[PDB]
Amino acid sequence: AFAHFVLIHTICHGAWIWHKLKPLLEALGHKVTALDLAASGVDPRQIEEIGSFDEYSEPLLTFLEALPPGEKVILVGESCGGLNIAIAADKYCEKIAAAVFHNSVLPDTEHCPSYVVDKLMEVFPDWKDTTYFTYTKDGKEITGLKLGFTLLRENLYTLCGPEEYELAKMLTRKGSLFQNILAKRPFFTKEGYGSIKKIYVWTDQDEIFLPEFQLWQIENYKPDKVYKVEGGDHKLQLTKTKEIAEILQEVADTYN
Amino acid sequence: AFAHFVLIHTICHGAWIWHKLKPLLEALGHKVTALDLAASGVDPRQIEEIGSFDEYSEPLLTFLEALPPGEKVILVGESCGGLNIAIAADKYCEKIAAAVFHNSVLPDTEHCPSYVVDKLMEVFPDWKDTTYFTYTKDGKEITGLKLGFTLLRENLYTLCGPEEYELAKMLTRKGSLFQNILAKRPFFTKEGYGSIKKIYVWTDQDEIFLPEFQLWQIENYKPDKVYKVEGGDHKLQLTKTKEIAEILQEVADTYN
Numbered sequence: 001a002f003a004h005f006v007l008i009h010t011i012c013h014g015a016w017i018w019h020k021l022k023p024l025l026e027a028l029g030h031k032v033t034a035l036d037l038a039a040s041g042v043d044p045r046q047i048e049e050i051g052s053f054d055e056y057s058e059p060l061l062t063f064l065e066a067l068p069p070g071e072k073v074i075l076v077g078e079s080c081g082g083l084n085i086a087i088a089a090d091k092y093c094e095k096i097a098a099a100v101f102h103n104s105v106l107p108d109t110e111h112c113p114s115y116v117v118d119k120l121m122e123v124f125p126d127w128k129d130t131t132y133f134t135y136t137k138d139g140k141e142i143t144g145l146k147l148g149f150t151l152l153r154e155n156l157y158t159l160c161g162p163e164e165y166e167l168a169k170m171l172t173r174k175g176s177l178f179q180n181i182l183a184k185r186p187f188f189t190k191e192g193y194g195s196i197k198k199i200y201v202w203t204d205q206d207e208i209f210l211p212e213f214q215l216w217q218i219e220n221y222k223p224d225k226v227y228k229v230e231g232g233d234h235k236l237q238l239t240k241t242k243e244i245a246e247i248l249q250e251v252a253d254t255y256n
Numbered sequence: 257a258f259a260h261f262v263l264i265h266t267i268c269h270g271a272w273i274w275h276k277l278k279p280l281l282e283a284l285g286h287k288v289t290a291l292d293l294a295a296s297g298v299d300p301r302q303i304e305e306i307g308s309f310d311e312y313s314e315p316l317l318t319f320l321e322a323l324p325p326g327e328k329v330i331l332v333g334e335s336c337g338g339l340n341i342a343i344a345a346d347k348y349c350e351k352i353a354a355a356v357f358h359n360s361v362l363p364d365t366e367h368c369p370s371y372v373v374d375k376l377m378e379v380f381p382d383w384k385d386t387t388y389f390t391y392t393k394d395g396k397e398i399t400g401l402k403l404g405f406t407l408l409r410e411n412l413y414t415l416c417g418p419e420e421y422e423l424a425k426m427l428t429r430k431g432s433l434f435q436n437i438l439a440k441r442p443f444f445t446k447e448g449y450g451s452i453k454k455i456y457v458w459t460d461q462d463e464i465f466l467p468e469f470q471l472w473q474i475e476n477y478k479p480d481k482v483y484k485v486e487g488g489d490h491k492l493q494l495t496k497t498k499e500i501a502e503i504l505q506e507v508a509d510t511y512n
Binding site for chain 1: 270271272274275276278279283290297298300302418419420421422423426427429
């Protein structure tokens with residue numbers, strides 16, 4: 001079967017992270033959309049204009065709004081993209097055939113929206129050469145970050161080639177987790193986000209979303225299906241592109 | 257010998273085009289800077305804010321200004337980047353050890369700054385699915401363009417891999433040649449631009465800067481040295497990366 005995949009990058013990244021996966025999925029016959037979220041990739045906003053994870057998600061919500069009735073998509077979120085998935089599913093659950101989490105945060109419906117981010121920061125507290133700043137938007141103080149180049153090399157892009165790491169140095173931008181804003185946000189709903197099919201893809205060689213964290217997430221909020229990719233690194237869509245495409249084909253054949 | 261190379265992308269592109277070349281040059285021991293010009297790559301401006309090729313060049317001029325006395329660089333410009341080189345050389349000639357033109361426009365000092373662009377448009381008049389728009393800045397009507405995806409596939413990225421073409425679809429932005437503004441600009445000077453060493457690198461398999469055009473440029477304004485790369489396509493820094501690095505090493509050993 002063929003599907004329409006919507007690929008959702010993580011914070012400080014953009015659609016460019018999907019540059020290897022998108023043509024492979026198209027070569028299987030699928031339709032693929034790779035979005036830039038707000039203030040990401042070549043989106044024209046700067047992060048200091050964005051006040052919440054919900055505002056950050058606007059391009060994904062606008063895309064989903066534009067789907068004609070009856071058209072469903074499979075969302076694929078890497079790393080922090082799982083939060084964009086949860087936000088989107090609470091507005092457009094009927095348009096979502098399934099969500100695929102790719103070394104991603106897996107929010108739940110029992111705890112506040114910041115819960116899994118808070119846990120990540122306990123498991124992985126040292127962000128190396130990452131820098132931080134603050135800005136104010138809509139009366140709140142937001143902590144922004146710019147991912148450190150050593151962190152990128154060692155922890156996110158561990159086994160990627162030098163030309164892929166170079167793209168990350170060139171293209172990663174300032175971003176935010178909006179952690180304190182998430183902590184005050186209404187919970188994700190059981191009727192919307194809770195109702196979608198959820199497929200969790202990971203590798204135990206991820207050097208930032210460490211096995212303790214990912215296995216904790218799986219136990220916290222049971223996925224419909226789990227796929228463990230052997231080897232690779234946090235950027236499986238670069239280091240294990242073919243394996244990711246094969247999994248996504250199976251998802252397209254299972255959920256519609 | 258080691259040099260400091262400053263890599264200069266073409267219109268509608270950004271530093272990202274150099275993602276393969278930059279690590280190869282660093283692996284030879286060089287220092288490499290790959291700039292985003294105005295309204296290009298992840299630069300925060302939009303093209304409608306930019307009124308001339310000189311304004312477009314600001315990041316290159318600002319970079320050159322910041323070099324301490326006595327430090328020289330080798331400029332490397334692809335495609336339209338040769339115009340940025342000429343602009344820069346008329347302000348900072350003493351900071352430029354040499355300029356390398358990479359399937360690039362080669363402005364002169366005898367004719368108006370638009371001369372080689374006007375010629376290009378005669379040799380290559382059909383830009384396929386490229387779209388155009390106009391905007392006004394500083395009282396002039398500027399023609400902007402967005403490179404067509406078929407043009408990108410067939411003429412610019414002819415022999416590049418699907419993942420490289422995908423990056424171009426994701427990252428190329430609206431831009432301008434500022435052709436009518438160039439046509440009114442004071443000529444490039446013999447004392448500044450005319451005085452720098454100029455190395456012309458090309459392939460006769462370029463499907464946009466066709467052999468008639470490139471050989472015309474070489475005859476029009478004799479380079480100090482010409483290197484012809486066999487095979488490849490217009491994006492030699494993607495299809496012939498190693499050969500480009502080898503040439504640049506020789507340039508670093510010849511000009512300081």
